[PDB]
Design a protein that fits this description.
The protein is an alpha+beta fold. It folds into two domains: about 70 residues, SH3 type barrels (Roll); about 70 residues, Orthogonal Bundle (Transcription Termination Factor Rho, Rna-binding Domain, Chain A, Domain 1), CATH 1.10.720. The protein contains five helices and five strands. It is globular, with a radius of gyration of 15 Å. Belongs to the class I-like SAM-binding methyltransferase superfamily. C5-methyltransferase family. It comes from Homo sapiens. It is found in: Nucleus.
């Protein structure tokens, strides 16, 4: 009965989170019991940031679905920041596993990131954003 307030998103969803002074950052909605902090305020979600690992209380209106990738992926931040790329890898790796997608490889971080970024930017085909959903 957690996060049952009429707003969007639930435990396990992959999301873009927005905090003041940062780019849209990939996260996963978690339960407050995973944060060891406190119950989220009504209308809010606890998220865990990819690449970074910390927990934040974010309003459900300031979250969007990770599947809306092209609209929130930040090419400039991807170019100037290494942590963003690491976060891209870890978010898309959770995505790739949930969707049943596989990529040919044998490789540095950007080498495996290239086909994952292409997949995500192209719309997560053939599965779609529906294949991102938690189990």
């Amino acid at each position: 009965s957690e996060y049952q307030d009429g707003k969007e998103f639930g435990i396990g969803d992959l999301v873009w989170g927005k905090i003041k002074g940062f780019s849209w950052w990939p996260a996963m909605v978690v339960s407050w019991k995973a944060t060891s902090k406190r119950q989220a305020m009504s209308g809010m979600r606890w998220v865990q940031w990819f690449g970074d690992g910390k927990f934040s209380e974010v309003s459900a209106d300031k979250l969007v679905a990770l599947g809306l990738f092209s609209q929130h992926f930040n090419l400039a931040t991807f170019n100037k920041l290494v942590s963003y790329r690491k976060a891209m890898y870890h978010a898309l790796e959770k995505a790739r596993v949930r969707a049943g997608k596989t990529f040919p490889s044998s490789d540095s971080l950007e080498d495996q990131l290239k086909p994952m970024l292409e997949w995500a930017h192209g719309g997560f085909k053939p599965t779609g954003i529906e294949g991102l959903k938690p189990n």
